[PDB]
Design a binder for this molecule. Structure first.
Ligand SMILES: CC(C)Oc1cc(C(=O)NC2CCN(C)CC2)ccc1Nc1ccc2c(n1)N(C1CCCC1)[C@H](C)C(=O)N2C
Length: 128
């Protein structure tokens, strides 16, 4: 029944919590940048993103496929390159967050593809 979307967001949340947030020294990417510490951030980064807000989107079942999800994770890296520069050590840990994310998704590719299909058919047929 409704379980398909909840299972999908469940697997997403855990990838974030137990594989992505586990990257060494990734804590600065766990939460929105605190303006108190980086006063220009929200002036040079126009679309902020972080793992906690991604989790909040997961709580609200924002992502129904891998792809809108990867959009937001990739954004975290895109944002680090603009603020910190392409070969900053902070950009490099964001890179690895992006990497372990893709690594996990392909591990569960066939499993997630099933979930993804059932959700789109439900959606597209809910409009009857
Ligand atoms: C400890 C210190 C080093 O950092 C922070 C500390 C704190 C801190 O203690 N907060 C607590 C909250 C609780 N209360 C009770 C006490 C205070 C917050 C942010 C720090 N820095 C930071 C964060 C993110 C980035 C970030 N820095 N950076 C780095 C690149 C250049 C600046 C540093 C950029 C903006 C970047 O992309 N990102 C994502």
């Amino acid at each position: 029944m409704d379980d398909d979307q909840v299972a999908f967001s469940f697997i997403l949340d855990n990838i974030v919590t137990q594989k992505m947030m586990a990257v060494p020294d990734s804590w600065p990417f766990h939460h929105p940048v605190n303006k108190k510490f980086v006063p220009d951030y929200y002036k040079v980064i126009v679309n902020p993103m972080d793992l906690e807000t991604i989790r909040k989107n997961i709580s609200k079942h924002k992502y129904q496929s891998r792809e809108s999800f990867l959009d937001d994770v990739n954004l975290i890296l895109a944002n680090s390159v603009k603020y910190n520069g392409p070969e900053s050590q902070y950009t490099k840990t964001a890179q690895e967050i992006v990497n372990v994310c893709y690594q996990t998704l392909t591990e569960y590719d066939e499993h997630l593809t099933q979930l993804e299909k059932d959700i789109c058919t439900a959606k597209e047929a809910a409009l009857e």
